[PDB]
């Protein structure tokens, strides 16, 4: 009754977005009409309320639009792809990922840590958002890697789909063991 009536009012890179836009649309239309009738073409957390799926869904299609006229990584429909893409594009120019001919992402979050003084350091928060980051594919630097911490970037909280892995320096004041058990990770998608 009330539930459906509601939802209704809310309804080597170009290669990539082409499929996003494309795919999004098909889903736009698909769900657009499928509802009208009555009267997960992408990955998201097991449990997650309907209102949020919709709320988030709606925000993703907009993400989509802003892309047409022309990057919320964990908001795209195929994050894996966008990356495997940038691999070649970022490669089609200059050419192992690395953070800081390279792209920039926003919408990610630090889980179990915070970034103070160009490094990972302890916190009382379960997770804090990252406004943006620069990644670059290398071949060069990954040599001083025994003094840095490997932080995995998962599609989302569940920690069940790894997009890629990124190396970062950490507040050496704490043990490398204290860190390994802290289990810091990065979610590319965080709800609010």
């Amino acid at each position: 009754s009330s539930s459906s009536e509601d939802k209704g009012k809310a309804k080597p890179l170009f290669r990539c977005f082409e499929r996003e836009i494309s795919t999004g649309g098909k889903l736009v239309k698909k769900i657009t009409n499928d509802l009208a009738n009555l009267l997960k073409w992408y990955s998201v957390p097991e449990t997650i309320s309907l209102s949020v799926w919709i709320s988030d869904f709606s925000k993703r299609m907009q993400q989509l639009s802003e892309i047409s006229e022309s990057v919320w990584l964990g908001g795209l429909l195929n994050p894996e792809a966008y990356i495997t893409a940038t691999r070649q594009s970022a490669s089609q120019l200059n050419g192992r990922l690395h953070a800081s001919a390279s792209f920039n992402v926003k919408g990610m979050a630090l889980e179990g840590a915070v970034w103070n003084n160009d490094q990972l350091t302890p916190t009382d928060i379960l997770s804090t958002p990252i406004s943006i980051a620069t990644l670059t594919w290398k071949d060069p630097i990954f040599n001083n890697s025994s003094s840095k911490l490997s932080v995995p970037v998962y599609l989302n909280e569940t920690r069940s789909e790894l997009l890629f892995s990124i190396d970062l320096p950490y507040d050496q004041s704490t043990s490398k063991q204290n860190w390994y058990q802290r289990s810091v990770s990065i979610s590319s998608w965080k709800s609010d």
């Binding site: 309320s49 209102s51 949020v52 709320s55 009382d124 609010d192």
Partner: protein
């Protein structure tokens, strides 16, 4: 996993009347009805708790509680028992804000407060209270502050007077609502506490398997031991 039978309740009811320890000396009618009125709850919980997984012993305890005060002085308002179950369920659609409180509350926090003032009449004057006496709600809405959140006594009294409800039990319930709204990790702490202010520090406490299987279970009723993966009850049986 929670299939309970009428026969099972009737069995509890029988003992509430006859085999009630708490009631084996007095014979006065208007005296005995006192124990009878309250013991139905605790006695039912004693028998049901044996089937419930730990995270559900309080959940069912809250239901039993809400029912026991029904029709008494300290009976929980519907709007109040409602907010607990649905409160803020729509948060992701709240566009109203509370400017007057940016120096004190986050965005989501404000949103939540709008729900409270909006859904529950007892909290009609919460935003104005938070406004007038900021330094009490101070540490409450505050980040990394050692010390458990503290709902200001000033509020636990101001509101205890606005509504014609000066009851502890009801007061303890209004505390769950604030916690659901601003500290979800405290919901259990405070629920437990509320339940305990109706029955007793003890009602929610952990069972001789001797008696049960002996003089407390009719032979027509089997004994199941539904367990969690990897856990084997098999032993327990062979023992007895």
């Amino acid at each position: 996993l929670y299939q309970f039978s009428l026969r099972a309740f009737l069995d509890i009811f029988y003992n509430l009347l006859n085999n009630n320890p708490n009631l084996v000396d007095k014979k006065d009618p208007n005296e005995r009805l006192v124990y009878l009125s309250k013991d139905i709850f605790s006695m039912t919980f004693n028998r049901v708790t044996r089937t419930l997984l730990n995270d559900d012993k309080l959940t069912f305890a809250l239901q039993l509680t809400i029912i026991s005060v029904k029709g008494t002085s300290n009976e929980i308002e519907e709007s109040e028992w409602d907010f607990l179950l649905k409160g803020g369920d729509n948060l992701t659609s709240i566009k109203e804000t509370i400017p007057q409180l940016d120096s004190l509350l986050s965005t989501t926090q404000q949103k939540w407060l709008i729900c409270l003032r909006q859904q529950v009449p007892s909290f009609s004057k919460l935003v104005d209270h938070i406004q007038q006496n900021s330094s009490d709600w101070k540490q409450f809405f505050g980040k990394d502050q050692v010390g458990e959140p503290i709902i200001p006594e000033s509020w636990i009294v101001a509101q205890a007077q606005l509504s014609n409800q000066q009851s502890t039990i009801v007061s303890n319930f209004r505390k769950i609502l604030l916690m659901k709204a601003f500290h979800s990790d405290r919901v259990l702490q405070y629920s437990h506490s509320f339940v305990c202010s109706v029955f007793g520090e003890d009602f929610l406490n952990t069972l001789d398997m001797a008696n049960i299987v002996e003089k407390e279970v009719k032979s027509s009723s089997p004994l199941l031991l539904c367990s969690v993966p990897g856990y084997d009850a098999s032993s327990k049986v062979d023992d007895l």
